[PDB]
């Protein structure tokens, strides 16, 4: 009942070069990685590696909704901005390859009320 | 530097050639005030006339120029009053050292007083 992504365990994915991992991700993620990380994404990755190495034991918050989830981020907790607040996202192995913004909805679910004046032809 | 330092007397000719030889050279020259600025001027030799006034207490930022006097030629003179020093050259404040570099038509009396100070005490 272990986890496997294309026939590979999580540990095998940990010791994989970035370029090698791009061949297993889908087309959009392969193109994005081939074009390089943005400088803000670079800063976030530096903080993530620092936290993994045993340093920086403070919550990690970010405005980077377009960051792709990588195998080295699994196990951490990251606070992703959704427009007005930073919401907590816990990285699970099955999240590998998705954008962070996919886990921080920006809109509230709609619960409708009673239609008002002007909502029908005979109500105007 | 400061009145509380007996170097020599207050010769009238020294004030005569240190004060009344810069108003006619202000309109034809450059001026660099400030002991922090001049410390570099004096060390690197940028300054041409070091006029050091006796108004700076304590002997903390004044105890740099007299020790550095014998390292370069530094034709140097002293100013009795500070209120009008900026009026003679600069602005309407109290100045500590107004360095003029290469002034126009300000040579004969300056050379004579510099020779007198060289033959006075160094």
């Amino acid at each position: 009942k272990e986890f496997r992504y294309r026939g590979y365990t999580l540990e095998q994915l940990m010791n994989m070069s970035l370029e090698e991992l791009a061949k297993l991700l889908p087309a959009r993620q392969r193109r994005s990685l081939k074009r390089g990380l943005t400088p803000e994404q670079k800063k976030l990755l530096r903080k993530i590696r620092l936290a993994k190495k045993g340093k920086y034991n403070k919550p990690i918050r970010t405005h980077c909704r377009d960051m792709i989830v990588l195998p080295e981020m699994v196990g951490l907790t990251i606070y992703v901005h959704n427009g007005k607040e930073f919401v907590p996202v816990e990285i699970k192995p099955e999240m590998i390859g998705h954008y962070l913004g996919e886990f921080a909805p920006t809109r509230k679910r709609v619960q409708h009320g009673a239609p008002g004046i002007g909502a029908t032809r005979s109500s105007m | 530097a400061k009145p509380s330092y007996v170097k020599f007397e207050v010769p009238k000719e020294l004030a005569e050639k240190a004060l009344q030889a810069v108003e006619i050279a202000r309109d034809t020259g450059k001026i660099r005030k400030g002991t922090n600025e001049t410390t570099k001027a004096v060390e690197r030799g940028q300054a041409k006339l070091v006029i050091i006034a006796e108004d700076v207490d304590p002997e903390e930022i004044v105890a740099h120029l007299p020790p550095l006097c014998e390292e370069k030629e530094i034709p140097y003179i002293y100013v009795p009053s500070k209120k009008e020093l900026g009026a003679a050259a600069g602005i309407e404040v109290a100045a500590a050292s107004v360095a003029i570099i290469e002034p126009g038509k300000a040579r004969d009396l300056v050379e004579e007083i510099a020779m007198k100070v060289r033959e006075l005490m160094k």
Partner: protein, 69 residues
Amino acid sequence: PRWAVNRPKDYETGRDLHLITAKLDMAIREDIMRLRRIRAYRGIRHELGLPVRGQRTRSNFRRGQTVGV
């Protein structure tokens, strides 16, 4: 050819597979369930029964009865 099968690059094994009938249905159900377990935007759209591929929903996609004022 490998570009003609209905499940290229399988998520578990990584091979190029083709499925029919019950296995196909269970694989689709597993894909949707995996999306739902991680609480991805698409999984939430699947749960609420709303369009998942970016459509506008103000005018069309109406299934119900008229509300009165």
